[PDB]
């Protein structure tokens, strides 16, 4: 087969060719080799699966929007329903692959607290995606696991990272989104976003050369979500 360096280069080609399923397959192999990922590799894996799952989430939203309209012929409404179920199946397979990686290889072996937080946030994200399409009893499971991952990441990050750290900020972003869209708690969502942005503003001196751009960007996303939500 191929070695780690070869797999990573293949992943970069795939990314440029916009072949994200290929990319995810390569980064999956690398991860399964069992060794801790460099920042580069870690980012490659994240991007790959974000795009793979992203395509399916987008398709699911389109089909659902369409599913909202009276359709006398039961075979059209029903047709679209079965198609939606297909998409949900693909989606669950992807998310379950990611969560498998996170539990077998990535989180347990994470040395730096930054890496730990990154992987736990990833786990929260993918359980959240499952939640977006999950059903009755399964939905409870999915939502709980999401919140647990987000909560652990959040505590670790408040203890170990600076409020301007992009990983910490993005964690806050996604977690607030979780409260708003998943737990339907607009109040707590806004509270979390506002607190995060405010703490980041208080300590602008903690910014550094390597990530000040990503920091300010995410702060912007936080404030944007805030405005969109408060109404």
């Amino acid at each position: 087969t191929m070695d780690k360096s070869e797999l990573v280069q293949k992943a970069k080609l795939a990314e440029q060719a916009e072949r994200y399923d290929d990319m995810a397959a390569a980064m999956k192999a690398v991860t399964e080799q069992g060794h801790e990922l460099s920042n580069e590799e870690r980012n490659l894996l994240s991007v790959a699966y974000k795009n793979v799952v992203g395509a399916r989430r987008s398709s699911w939203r389109v089909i659902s929007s369409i599913e909202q309209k009276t359709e006398r012929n039961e075979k059209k409404q029903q047709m679209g329903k079965e198609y939606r179920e297909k998409i949900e199946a693909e989606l669950q397979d992807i998310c379950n692959d990611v969560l498998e990686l996170l539990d077998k290889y990535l989180i347990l072996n994470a040395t730096q607290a930054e890496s730990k937080v990154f992987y736990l946030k990833m786990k929260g994200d993918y359980f959240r995606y499952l939640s977006e399409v999950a059903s009755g009893e399964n939905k409870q499971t999915t939502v709980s696991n999401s919140q647990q991952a987000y909560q652990e990441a959040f505590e670790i990050s408040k203890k170990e990272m600076q409020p301007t750290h992009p990983i910490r900020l993005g964690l806050a972003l996604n977690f607030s989104v979780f409260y708003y869209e998943i737990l339907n708690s607009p109040e707590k969502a806004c509270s979390l976003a506002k607190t995060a942005f405010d703490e980041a503003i208080a300590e602008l001196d903690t910014l550094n050369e390597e990530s000040y751009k990503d920091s300010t960007l995410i702060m912007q996303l936080l404030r944007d979500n805030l405005t969109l939500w408060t109404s």
Binding site: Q68, L217, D224, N225, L228
Partner: peptide, 21 residues
């Protein structure tokens, strides 16, 4: 950078329109 912001905006707005209504 503003494209990231626009994508984000659209993705949140979608939930606001289709899941809240």
């Amino acid at each position: 950078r503003d494209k990231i912001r626009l994508n984000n905006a659209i993705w949140r707005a979608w939930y606001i329109q289709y899941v809240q209504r």
